[PDB]
Paper text:
JGFN4 expressed in E. coli was purified as a mixture of monomers and non-covalent homodimers, separable by size-exclusion chromatography. Both the monomeric and non-covalent dimeric forms of JGFN4 were subjected to crystallization screening and yielded crystals in the presence of fentanyl. The structures were determined by molecular replacement phasing and refined to 1.68 and 1.55-Å resolution for crystals obtained with the monomeric and dimeric species, respectively. Unexpectedly, both crystal structures showed a domain-swapped homodimer of JGFN4, with each protomer bound to one fentanyl molecule. Interestingly, the homodimer formed as a result of reciprocal swapping of the C-terminal β-strand of each protomer, mediated by an extended conformation and intermolecular interaction of CDR3. Fentanyl was surrounded by CDR1, CDR2, and a juxtaposed loop between CDR2 and CDR3, which formed a turn of a helix. The N-phenylpropanamide moiety of fentanyl is inserted into a deep pocket formed between the two layers of β-sheets that form the core of the VHH. Hydrophobic contacts are made with A24, M34, K71, V78, and R53 side chains and van der Waals contacts with the main chain atoms of V31 and N32. In CDR2, R53 also donates a hydrogen bond to the carbonyl oxygen atom of fentanyl and to the S29 carbonyl group from CDR1 to help shape the pocket. Hydrogen bonding is also observed between N76 and the tertiary amine nitrogen atom of the piperidine moiety on fentanyl. The phenyl ethyl moiety N-linked to the piperidine was pointed away from the protein and exposed to the solvent, where its conformation was crystal form-dependent.
Variable-heavy-heavy domains (VHHs) or nanobodies are single-domain heavy-chain only fragments found in members of the camelidae family (camels, llamas, alpacas, etc.). To explore antibody applications beyond traditional heavy-light chain mAbs, we identified and biophysically characterized a novel single-domain antibody specific for fentanyl from a camelid variable-heavy-heavy (VHH) domain phage display library. Our lead VHH (JGFN4) was specific for fentanyl and displayed no cross-reactivity with the closely related synthetic opioid carfentanil. The recognition of the fentanyl by JGFN4 was driven by hydrophobic interactions between the bottom of the binding pocket with the N-phenylpropanimide moiety and hydrogen bonding with a tertiary amine in the piperidine ring.
Residue numbers in the entry:
A (entry chain C), B (entry chain A): 1 to 113
The structure:
Amino acid sequence: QVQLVESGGGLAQAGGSLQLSCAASGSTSRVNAMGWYRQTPGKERELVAAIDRSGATVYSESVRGRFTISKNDAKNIVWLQMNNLTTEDTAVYYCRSGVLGSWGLGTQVTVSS
Amino acid sequence: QVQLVESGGGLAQAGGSLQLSCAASGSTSRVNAMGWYRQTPGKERELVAAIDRSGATVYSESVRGRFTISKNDAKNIVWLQMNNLTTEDTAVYYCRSGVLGSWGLGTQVTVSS
Ligand SMILES: CCC(=O)N(c1ccccc1)C1CCN(CCc2ccccc2)CC1
Ligand SMILES: CCC(=O)N(c1ccccc1)C1CCN(CCc2ccccc2)CC1
């Protein structure tokens, strides 16, 4: 019952910037991860950036260093800042929510020397 | 109701390799993402690798290129292959499941020359 609304798309010139926004509404209290995906012409949809509740972020290799994901927790908004755009960035961009579950008990790894 | 069990931790020699496994049980039909996390002594727990149902993977900067996450869908197992271990990798490692939701309608971005 999460609802996601993406905005900010449009036309850019190569070397330009855009900022996308994703507004979540509905019952969002359990949502503790958010992601931006893109579908370039002809290709599989791919994760380009994600952010979790602790503020940790991860990016795909194709956008790492150029794109930045950030969030406004008080308004349930997630942003995608896209810098140094290329024609290879042309795509439909999608927002997606996630509910990350419980952890296991864990396993100790000890590296010596 | 999903239950996760991590195994395969132990003592590794500097520069050695380890393979961790995480077995999921319970009602797993909706689980469409899995992640490995680690908790270095004194520090926040951190994502190090994640995999989704389409086989896409993502890694933290600290492990990208050394660690590989893979899955056996038929047995509900995920694995973390850890190579060239150093003392900086000593930690408790945890598995975590996730349910990723619907996408939004998407927003077109078109970059020209
Ligand atoms: C990692 C993402 C994350 O954890 N969230 C998030 C989700 C989408 C977009 C931005 C952030 C939280 C979801 C729950 N909301 C709280 C409850 C609420 C309800 C209505 C208005 C304001 C707040 C805080 C942020
Ligand atoms: C990216 C993760 C993912 O999508 N999954 C997954 C989850 C945990 C660990 C490995 C993979 C699927 C979850 C549902 N199972 C299906 C049914 C079933 C039941 C009992 C035994 C075997 C299979 C297929 C794999």
